[PDB]
């Protein structure tokens, strides 16, 4: 099959700046009829992908002249000048020349904003959950930037990596930040075998964790 390799996979941009997205195919996508059936699609949260560009360089209905497609053979580029809010979403390249038809992996176009530290909150299991014989320890890391924060759990000083499930919001439309939930699930039995529960959020290239804790010998 023909591999459509898309670069980069994450594209943070400021409004008004230019965005360029590379799509490279593993083989020529020149069809036997001499046309190159290369399209670009844009998908926003909870919607079908929408066509932007077809046959490499033609703009579909409703696409403004700030979008232009170019390239040939195996090297293709989508350029967006003066990015607007309505442009943010996930961009996919695609070749319709050779079966199986294939899409690139997606490039997320997102807004750059100033770095922001998470508001971190830790929550022990509820009495309700404990009487049903479960234990989940929840940590919210809210309204931070950029998306790739790191979260670690400690139990009685020992870092623990098993039974941890994470979930992320999409970029907020109002403040352009990200949020995340991190839930350590334990058996009620192993939960009650330890005292100290720690959630620590380390952004980026830090250095200094924001640490939230509770100790069952006090709760």
């Amino acid at each position: 099959d023909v591999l459509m390799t898309q670069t980069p996979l994450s594209l943070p941009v400021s409004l008004g700046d230019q965005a360029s997205i590379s799509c490279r195919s593993s083989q020529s996508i020149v069809h036997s009829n001499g046309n190159t059936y290369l399209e670009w699609y844009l998908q926003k949260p909870g919607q079908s992908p929408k066509l932007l560009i077809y046959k490499v360089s033609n703009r579909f209905s409703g696409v403004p002249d700030r979008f232009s497609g170019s390239g040939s053979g195996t090297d293709f580029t989508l350029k967006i000048s003066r990015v607007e809010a309505e442009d943010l979403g996930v961009y996919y390249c695609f070749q319709g020349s050779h079966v199986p038809l294939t899409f690139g992996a997606g490039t997320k176009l997102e807004i750059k904003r100033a770095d922001a530290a998470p508001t971190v909150s830790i929550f022990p299991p509820s009495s309700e959950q404990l009487t049903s014989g479960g234990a989940s320890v929840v940590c919210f890391l809210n309204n931070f930037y950029p998306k790739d924060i790191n979260v670690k759990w400690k139990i009685d000083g020992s870092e623990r990596q098993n039974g941890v499930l994470n979930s992320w919001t999409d970029q907020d439309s109002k403040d352009s930040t990200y949020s995340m939930s991190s839930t350590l699930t334990l058996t009620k039995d192993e939960y009650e075998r330890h005292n100290s529960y720690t959630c620590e959020a380390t952004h980026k290239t830090s250095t200094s964790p924001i640490v939230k804790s509770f100790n069952r010998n006090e709760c």
Binding site: L101, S179, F214
Partner: protein, 221 residues
């Protein structure tokens, strides 16, 4: 409007057969050389092309699934059909019907269906258990964050509101995760210290598939 509409089960078990119908209007699959096909997208994943069928009953298949995939049409009804035999959990995805003609306002996916979510799972229907997330006392500040943990339900979706919808600002509801094969979701809500616990904060959870609706007041520890 040239439109495409996907229809079919929505929930299936491993080893069973996925069958979907694409109903078309605004164009004819009789037209030379019209074509309609299927593309799928797993949650949080990319797009995978599956198959395409043409006005002349020519058909193209993704070779990675060829023993499982059958595409067909009913020209008299203007319908296209997908069958995937021997499905498993990995076939869980949004399934899109798309138009693609050849030879010259075609050769593009200008026209997409809205998509239909199909879940493949051996799980049984199960109402969520709803747990309150009240802060450690004291921890500690201008803001106080509360939460709600919706645990062990099947299938998607659930809906969650805070205070019946009067709390909309500062709410973060997180996508469900599978802890298998049941879903768990959480939501945080942030208010001023002034607000809570003097006023009551309640989490409203609905699970349509089990016709469950539940509230859970966040009581202080």
């Amino acid at each position: 409007q040239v439109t495409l509409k996907e229809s079919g089960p929505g929930i299936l078990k491993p080893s069973q057969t996925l069958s979907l119908t694409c109903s078309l209007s605004g164009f004819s699959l009789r037209t030379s050389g019209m074509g309609v096909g299927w593309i799928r997208q797993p949650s949080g994943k990319g797009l995978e092309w599956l198959a395409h069928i043409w006005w002349d009953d020519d058909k193209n298949y993704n070779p990675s699934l060829k023993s499982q995939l059958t595409i067909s049409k009913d020209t008299s009804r203007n319908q296209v059909f997908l069958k995937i035999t021997s499905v498993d959990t990995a076939d869980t995805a949004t399934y899109y019907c798309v138009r693609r003609a050849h030879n010259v306002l075609g050769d593009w996916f200008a026209y997409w269906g809205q998509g239909t979510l199909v879940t493949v799972s051996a799980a049984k229907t199960t109402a969520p258990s709803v747990y309150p997330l009240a802060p450690v006392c004291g921890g500690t500040g201008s803001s106080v964050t509360l939460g709600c943990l919706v645990k062990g339900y099947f299938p998607e979706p659930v809906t969650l509101t805070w205070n019946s919808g009067s709390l909309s600002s500062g709410v973060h509801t997180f996508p469900a995760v599978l802890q298998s094969g049941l879903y768990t979701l959480s939501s945080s809500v942030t208010v001023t210290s002034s607000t809570w616990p003097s006023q009551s904060i309640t989490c409203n959870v609905a699970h349509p598939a089990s016709s469950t609706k539940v509230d859970k007041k966040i009581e202080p520890r």
